[PDB]
Amino acid sequence: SRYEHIPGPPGRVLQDVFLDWAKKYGPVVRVNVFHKTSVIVTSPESVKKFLMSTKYNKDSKMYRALQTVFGERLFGQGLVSECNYERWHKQRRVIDLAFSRSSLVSLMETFNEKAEQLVEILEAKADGQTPVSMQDMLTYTAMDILAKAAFGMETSMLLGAQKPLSQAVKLMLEGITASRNKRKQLREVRESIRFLRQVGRDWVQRRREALKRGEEVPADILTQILKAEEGAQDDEGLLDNFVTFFIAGHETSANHLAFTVMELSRQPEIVARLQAEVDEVIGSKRYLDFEDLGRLQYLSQVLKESLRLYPPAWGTFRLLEEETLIDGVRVPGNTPLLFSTYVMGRMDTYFEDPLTFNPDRFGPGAPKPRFTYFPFSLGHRSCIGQQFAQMEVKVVMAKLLQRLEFRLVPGQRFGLQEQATLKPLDPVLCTLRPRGW
Ligand code: HEM
Ligand SMILES: O=C(C1CC1)n1ccc2c(-c3cnco3)cc(C(F)(F)F)cc21
């Protein structure tokens, strides 16, 4: 009853329903999300007010399904799911060191090596006939990159290894979804979460044993994850961040790559322009240097436009503590506010012809979106891995565009699914040819 006065209702996803309601009912709309009454806020004035202030913190109730699933601790109080400002700030500042310019520049070797491995695997299948799941292949690549870059470990998913680990991730993601929106499913989800935490325990032991033997350990994300736990009573905080980074550090990047390949399959002119750009910047070089990344300007725009229509992480929640007027609507105290870059990206009020894929929206001369576009969120709780992700995806995309032509298999859909994050409903099945053919 406390919300009844708020405007609202009395390969398609829940986010599409929210979009329809925002269009119908205005910038402040009552909705049910994660079993809780929330208010979706879609004015840029509100995005700015709430996201750009340390006064507004995440609503812990809306992160429960990341913290724990079916009684199994998952992300716990890791960097994404910690909602206490002071606890978050402490760990954020330590882990930030692993995302410095210099830290990220050193990762270019890993990015290049895994992208090269992917391209070689794909080239061998480029007979214009063999169907290849680009969603699967890009997910394996993202996983392999993350494991090496963040933890110094070789998952070798591109070689067909670690199928149990692949299964564990899938079931865990299904578990999050089931929790927030029987006997065998619970068993499989619980065991999957325990498995992921066990991988953490194993890899942490390997790190600590290497350090004690005085072997060479390159500073990485794990280094800082350990540093943040220096004098902790147990390893539960460490494992929280291990799992957080293990999942967050590949899942959204994989989704973003899959969406981009999927969309580009019906954009031949844009693809021809991307092919030309890659040809001009990197030529026949096997390896992309950091300085080459900045020169791939058109690719940068395509990837931004991809995130406008297809943000893997659709938004975020803040807790409104006290009754506040939001865009002429009285919103009661102790209310989750939902911010969605997905919704705002598809609203004609914010983007002309919103369903048109147009990289020119992000052109040098173009007016930059003002608080209407946030695929990495905004403010203090923005994505720590933004620059990491932007670099790795550019390396992967550039090498694909350098070497291969993709055709989406007829019947493949462009629809979305929500599985904790947004991703293509279909496997992005393509046939492939070498460039030139
Ligand atoms: C294209 C790829 C990516 C997208 C679209 C993305 C998106 C986001 C978004 C929207 C948030 C805010 C989430 C919230 O408010 O609940 C976030 C936070 C975060 N992301 Fe990402 N992300 C990406 C890649 C990565 C990578 C590569 C890493 C790690 C290597 C990562 C780790 C994190 C972490 C740890 C947070 C929590 C940050 C904090 O609260 O201090 N993400 N990301
Ligand atoms: O579920 C939520 C919230 C409450 C809405 N999330 C907020 C960001 C995020 C990320 C992520 C952020 N950067 C990289 O990955 C990943 C996932 C997961 F694990 F399901 F894949 C869930 C996420």
Curated annotation (Swiss-Prot):
Any idea which GO molecular function terms this record carries?
cholesterol 24-hydroxylase activity; heme binding; iron ion binding; steroid hydroxylase activity; testosterone 16-beta-hydroxylase activity; testosterone 6-beta-hydroxylase activity
Substrates-to-products reaction catalysed: cholesterol + reduced [NADPH--hemoprotein reductase] + O2 = (24S)-hydroxycholesterol + oxidized [NADPH--hemoprotein reductase] + H2O + H(+); cholestanol + reduced [NADPH--hemoprotein reductase] + O2 = (24S)-hydroxycholestanol + oxidized [NADPH--hemoprotein reductase] + H2O + H(+); 7-dehydrocholesterol + reduced [NADPH--hemoprotein reductase] + O2 = cholesta-5,7-dien-3beta,24S-diol + oxidized [NADPH--hemoprotein reductase] + H2O + H(+); 7-dehydrocholesterol + reduced [NADPH--hemoprotein reductase] + O2 = cholesta-5,7-dien-3beta,25-diol + oxidized [NADPH--hemoprotein reductase] + H2O + H(+)
Q: What is its EC number?
A: 1.14.14.25
Q: How does it sit in the membrane?
A: Single-pass membrane protein
Residues the record lists as binding heme: 383
Q: Does the keyword Oxidoreductase apply?
A: yes
Where in the body, by tissue, does this protein show up?
Expressed in brain. The mRNA was broadly distributed with higher levels in gray matter zones and lower levels in regions rich in white matter. Not detected in fetal sample but its expression increases linearly with age.
Broad enzyme group: oxidoreductase
Which keywords, in A-to-Z order, does the entry hold? Cell projection, Cholesterol metabolism, Endoplasmic reticulum, Heme, Iron, Lipid metabolism, Membrane, Metal-binding, Microsome, Monooxygenase, Oxidoreductase, Steroid metabolism, Sterol metabolism, Synapse, Transmembrane, Transmembrane helix
Q: Does the keyword Iron apply?
A: yes
Question: Mind telling me which Pfam families this protein's record contains?
Answer: p450 (PF00067)
Principal subcellular localization: endoplasmic reticulum
Q: In which pathway does it act?
A: Steroid metabolism; cholesterol degradation; Lipid metabolism; C21-steroid hormone metabolism
In terms of Gene3D superfamilies, this protein maps to: Cytochrome P450
Q: Where in the cell is it found?
A: Endoplasmic reticulum membrane; Microsome membrane; Postsynapse; Presynapse
Q: Which PROSITE patterns match?
A: CYTOCHROME_P450
Cofactor(s) this protein requires: heme
Where is the signal peptide, in residue numbers?
none
Question: What's one GO BP annotation on this UniProt entry?
Answer: cholesterol catabolic process
Record family assignment: Belongs to the cytochrome P450 family.
Functional summary from the UniProt entry: P450 monooxygenase that plays a major role in cholesterol homeostasis in the brain. By promoting constant cholesterol elimination in neurons, may activate the mevalonate pathway and coordinate the synthesis of new cholesterol and nonsterol isoprenoids involved in synaptic activity and learning.
**Name recorded for this polypeptide:** Cholesterol 24-hydroxylase
